Design a protein around this nucleic acid. Structure first.
Ligand code: NA
Length: 163
DNA sequence: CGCGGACTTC
């Protein structure tokens, strides 16, 4: 776990929620993410101030996390648009810019296995509980990421070299 | 026309 623990050192952790599975699959295919405006600004600021920003993905009502990734850029505007599957009532403009992300683990973790972890930055609720963009305290986020199964096909060299 | 937008078994 040496490489993973190096990637997680002094990181800030944010829960990411998706209304659908398709956009998380697209994010896994293309290494990008978009979020709503308040979260977009929060993530840009965190990227500029923190050693690493870790996004922990969870599809709404799925009962699981779907993986985690490290932000490798601030959100970009004006480029070729990502063709997200738009939830009902959401527009393409609402998703704003596009972050580049490097996946660290693309395996699932069921909520049953994280039930012992509570988040002191969210009223000490189980870490599975949170809106999109909910920040997770350092120790809680680190232990949560360490619970995921190894992703045998990910090469962490690119992440580590960027850092 | 900009208009407010991706929690958890309640
Ligand atoms: Na997938």
């Amino acid at each position: 776990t040496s490489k993973l623990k190096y990637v997680l050192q002094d990181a800030r952790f944010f829960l990411i929620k998706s209304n659908n599975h398709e956009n998380v699959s697209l994010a896994k295919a293309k290494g990008v993410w978009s979020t709503l405006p308040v979260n977009e600004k929060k993530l840009n600021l965190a990227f500029r101030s923190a050693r690493s920003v870790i996004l922990i993905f969870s599809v709404r009502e799925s009962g699981k996390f779907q993986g985690f990734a490290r932000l490798s850029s601030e959100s970009h505007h004006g480029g070729s648009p990502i063709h997200w599957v738009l939830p009902a009532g959401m527009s393409a403009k609402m998703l704003g810019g596009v972050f580049k992300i490097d996946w660290i683990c693309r395996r699932e973790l069921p909520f049953t296995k994280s039930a012992h972890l509570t988040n002191p930055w969210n009223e000490h609720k189980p870490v599975k509980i949170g809106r999109d963009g909910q920040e997770i305290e350092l120790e809680c986020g680190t232990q949560l990421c360490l619970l995921f199964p190894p992703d045998e096909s990910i090469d962490l060299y690119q992440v580590i070299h960027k850092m």
